[PDB]
Each structure stands twice: as structure tokens, then as C-alpha cells.
Design a protein around this ligand. Structure first.
Ligand code: HEM
Ligand code: HEM
Lengths: 141, 146, 141, 146
């Protein structure tokens, strides 16, 4: 469970992300595809070349969804309801992959938030991504 | 995979009693029931709506036979699983786009099915040898992914 | 996320385990130690040989906890509260291990319940063990 | 592991800019803070109550230095990690009782520290290179477990 402090930390870091959310989303995917090639099995319909419009567009959607979650941290299940259905009934991405994208998102924020990525913030972000993943995978079975 | 004489012996003896067609149909069926998201690879198989539909689906049974059949061939080459499964590895990545984590799930369901089928004969030490084998096979099939 | 059918399947299967719960718990531990040797790192103080009274004793405690969990399937967090505390703040077993013991418990159930361990019951029990594992690791951080 | 000439060079180049003792104390401290259960081995280190206590703990830092010094030395033997870490693998298993999962956790924290430390220089390809290395070392350390 996200503590009051985690929620504060997450809001602080994401607020700093601000307008770059979309660019950070695209970079986190690129990191993922490179570091963990097996995640590419879910995107055979995409041009995965660096800076492709498809990756950029998808990076943007992923970032928007995370902003939504930050915005509704106290009611994530409700907020991400549609996305949880989508992943559970259509996309059907194995749950292990959520951990790999979370790690890559963590790396992207670390690389972009030198002042804000303290040990405490790092812990809170990791919990936050874990919680988002839990929500997205909740309806799988 | 490096198996001790005793583990190798264990694996072989049990495999001699396995009806690959039947065990194969069962393992695939249970994978699709227990981990329903795996169904994403079988849209053309027909009805997979309920456990009974899955288990009784003829395309599931057919495919299960095919998979366990290839698995069996790997038992004959425990000494070189990567080389044995190279071609299929490449197929599963390049043409089928199957996340290798599914290999791991199938391995575990297979263990569950052997235990279910063999009961008491599927002892802790026998299980341990099979766990090494399924992990090896999953590894081998994941090897040529890029 | 246990449906009414899942609850029914779990109580049914666990009902058939009955008095044998402790024997099965011991057997699941033994399966675990042999199959996934890294789990032995948590029990440096035990004699892990086959037939070990220590494993047997531990198996009985594990099994009883599972019985308590089935009895309170709709109120698991409260019923397992001291165990969640224990694992989170004292034992500190890495979360990954819970899935290894869950698998070994399924294999054990499979080996002893030929008629009961149908595909549908297998699915419900895996859901159940995942839920118990989630509760046991809920207070880790 | 098997790294392309290009990845080996990317790995080496960045490592030359690393203050081993600083980065070591930092990765170890973050591991204890982010995954608190790893604190189980360090009860003799004193105060680990808060993030600030952990990060400022002299013994955490000292341990961090030792661990990362070993890691560093390891980078000179990327072609033989298993051989290089054999003895440490056995020690970690037989006497320290460290679940190898902890190696994987430290490796992911190390990657985050490098990213934090280097910013944009820690590009996606450089990350990929380091990921293979941290997995390789975790694998080498877990190799002798039994
Ligand atoms: C925090 C984790 C994640 C979030 C927030 C997220 C969010 C989203 C969103 C918002 C969409 C688009 C929905 C729409 O257009 O209506 C999407 C689609 C998709 N996601 Fe997820 N996702 C996550 C994790 C993953 C993972 C780990 C994978 C696989 C490795 C994945 C694979 C996909 C795929 C294949 C699509 C469809 C893309 C397309 O066809 O355009 N997702 N995701
Ligand atoms: C369904 C999952 C599990 C359940 C229900 C469970 C339950 C329990 C119970 C009831 C106890 C005894 C507490 C007491 O003394 O009051 C215990 C202790 C312990 N458990 Fe867990 N446990 C689970 C998973 C695990 C896992 C996966 C591991 C590690 C591989 C683990 C390691 C331990 C250890 C080391 C102890 C202390 C044993 C002793 O020294 O006597 N447990 N657990």
C-alpha cells in the first residue's frame, strides 16, 4: 500500500516530469525493447526503430495513463478500470513484463531527475509502479 | 542440462509410462485454463470459453500432442537442449511472437499434470529432476530470441 | 479476486485435504527444498533431511495457516495479520519465494487428489495461493 | 557473458568515470531502502531505521565498498565470470545464506544509480550493455548454490 509519504513523493517527482511525460514514456519503451528483447513479442505490428512515430505515440499514451494514476492515487482501480480490462481481455500481456517496463521507467526518471531522485523518492516510485502494475493485472483471471 | 545419473534415470523411467498424446492435450488445456491470457496465441482454435470447452477442444488436443511430441525429442538429447531446439526457438520468436515466459508456465503445468497422473510415484526427487528438465527446455526455446 | 465459484472450489478441495493438511504441508516444503535449492537459504537452522521432524513441524504450521485462510477467505488480511507482520519485519523472505512454495503446494495437492484436482479446481487454488502470498507480503514496504 | 566489442567498450568507458567506494555505498544503501527485507543480513550494522540513517551508516558504506570493489574487479573478467566468482558463490551459499534474488535486486539498483549519476550519458544501449553484465554477475554468484 502507498503511504501518505509515498503519495507525496510520487506527486512531487511526477510534477517535475510535467510536460516531458510523453518523451520519457517513449524513452522508457526504447530502454525496454533494448534491455529486454523478449518484450518485443508484443509489438510485432510496430516499427520499433528509434524515434518512430508509433513508439512516440505509445510512449505518450503510457505517460498519460501514469499521470491519470498520479492524479487519482487514492482510487487507482477506478481510474485505470478501462486499461485493466484492455490488458486483461485483449492485449493479454504476461504479468512479468510489467516489472521490466517499471524498471525501465525507473531508469528513465533517474536519468532525468538528478535533484529529485533521492533514496526515499526512488523507493516511493518503485512502489507506485508496482501498484499500477498490480491494478493493470488484477482482472487477468 | 547437467543431471546426475539418478535424476536422468528418474526422468527416463517416468517418461516411458507417458502417453504423449493424452498428457500433451492435458498440459496445453490446463495452461489455457489456469493462465487464460495464454489464449492470445490460439484465436483460431475455436471455443475456449469454459474449462470444459478448452479441455474437450480438438485443436487444443491436437496441438498439445504436437508440443509434447517435440518436448519428448528433447528428452533424447538432454546433453544439448540448445542445439536440439534452435530451429524451433527461432520460429517461436520470429514467426509466432511467443513471449518465452509461456515456456516457463507450460513447464510448471506439465509438472502439475505428471503429479496428477502419477500420484505417489511422482516423488519429491523425481519432481526435482523434472523441474531441471522443464527449465532447461524453456531456456533452450528462449535462446534464439532477439 | 476470488469468485463465488473459486471460493467453493477451494473449500471443497481443502475440505478433502482434511486431517492430512499437515502431512501435505511437510511434503510441499520438501518438494520446494529439492526443486528450488535457493529456498534452503532461509532455513540454515533446520535439518532438511527427508523425514526431518523440523520440516514436519513447520509443514504443520504452514498448513494450519492455510486452513485459517480458507476459513476466512473473505477476511484474509485480518486473519493473517500477525503472519504478514512476521514475514515482513522478521523473516524477510524475498517475495519471489512465495510462488515457489505455491507451486509445490499445487503439485502436492495434485499428487494426492486425483479426482478433485480438475482444471477448474487447479485454476481456483492457484488464484487462492497467489492471494495468500499477496497478503503475506503486503507489509514488506 | 557474451558482449559485442562495442558493448564491452561502452561498459569499460563508463566504469572509468566511477568512484567505486561512493557508488558502492550508494547502491548498497539504496538496496536497503528500496527493498527493506534485504536488511535481514545487516542487523549487526546498527541503525537502519530511516533512509537517512541507512545512507549515512558507516558499516553500510564499508560493505558497499567491498561488494562494489569485487564487482569492479569482475569487469576485467567478463569472459570468465563463473570462474571469477566461484568461491564467492560458495561462500554466499554455504556460510552467508544469501538468497540469490538479492543479487538481482542489487543489479537493478546499481543500474538506477548509474543512470542517476550519469544522466544522458547512460543511454539506452549503454543500459542494455550494463543489464547483461548485472545479470551475468548475478548468474555467476548463484552458480554454486546447492
Ligand atoms: C505501467 C504499465 C503500463 C501502462 C500504464 C500501459 C498503458 C497502456 C495504454 C494507455 C495503452 C493504449 C490504450 C488505448 O489506446 O486505448 C496500452 C496499449 C498497449 N500496451 Fe500497455 N501499458 C503498460 C504495460 C504494458 C506492458 C509491460 C506491455 C508489454 C510489454 C504492454 C503492451 C501494450 C500493447 C501491445 C498495447 C497496444 C499498442 C497498440 O497496438 O497501439 N503494456 N498500454
Ligand atoms: C503460503 C505461504 C506461507 C505461509 C502460509 C507461511 C506460514 C508460516 C507460519 C505459520 C510460520 C510460523 C510462525 C510462528 O512461529 O508463529 C512461518 C514461519 C517461517 N516461514 Fe513462512 N509461510 C509461507 C511462506 C514462506 C516462504 C515462501 C518461506 C521461504 C522460502 C518461508 C519461510 C519461513 C521461515 C524461515 C519461518 C520461520 C521458521 C522457524 O524458524 O521456525 N515462509 N511461516
Amino acid at each position: 500500500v502507498l503511504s501518505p509519504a509515498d503519495k507525496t513523493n510520487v506527486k512531487a517527482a511526477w510534477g517535475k516530469v510535467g510536460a516531458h511525460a510523453g518523451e520519457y514514456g517513449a524513452e522508457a519503451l526504447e530502454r525496454m525493447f533494448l534491455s529486454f528483447p523478449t518484450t518485443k513479442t508484443y509489438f510485432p505490428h510496430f516499427d520499433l526503430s528509434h524515434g518512430s512515430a508509433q513508439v512516440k505515440g505509445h510512449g505518450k499514451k503510457v505517460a498519460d495513463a501514469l499521470t491519470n494514476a498520479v492524479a487519482h492515487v487514492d482510487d487507482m482501480p477506478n481510474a485505470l478500470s478501462a486499461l485493466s480490462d484492455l490488458h486483461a481481455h485483449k492485449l493479454r500481456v504476461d504479468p512479468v513484463n510489467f516489472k521490466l517496463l517499471s524498471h525501465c521507467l525507473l531508469v528513465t526518471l533517474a536519468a532525468h531527475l538528478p535533484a529529485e531522485f533521492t533514496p526515499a523518492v526512488h523507493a516511493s516510485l518503485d512502489k507506485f509502479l508496482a501498484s499500477v502494475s498490480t491494478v493493470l493485472t488484477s482482472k487477468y483471471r | 542440462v547437467h543431471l546426475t545419473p539418478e535424476e536422468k534415470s528418474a526422468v527416463t523411467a517416468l517418461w516411458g509410462k507417458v502417453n504423449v498424446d493424452e498428457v500433451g492435450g492435458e498440459a496445453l488445456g490446463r495452461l489455457l485454463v489456469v493462465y487464460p491470457w495464454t489464449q492470445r496465441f490460439f484465436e483460431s482454435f475455436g471455443d475456449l470459453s469454459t474449462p470444459d470447452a478448452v479441455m474437450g477442444n480438438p485443436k487444443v488436443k491436437a496441438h498439445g500432442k504436437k508440443v509434447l511430441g517435440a518436448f519428448s525429442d528433447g528428452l533424447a538429447h538432454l546433453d544439448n537442449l540448445k542445439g536440439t531446439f534452435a530451429t524451433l526457438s527461432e520460429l517461436h520468436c520470429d514467426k509466432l511472437h511467443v513471449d518465452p515466459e509461456n515456456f516457463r508456465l507450460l513447464g510448471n503445468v506439465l509438472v502439475c499434470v505428471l503429479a496428477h497422473h502419477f500420484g505417489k510415484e511422482f516423488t519429491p526427487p523425481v519432481q526435482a529432476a523434472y523441474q531441471k528438465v522443464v527449465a532447461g527446455v524453456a531456456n533452450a526455446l528462449a535462446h534464439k530470441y532477439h
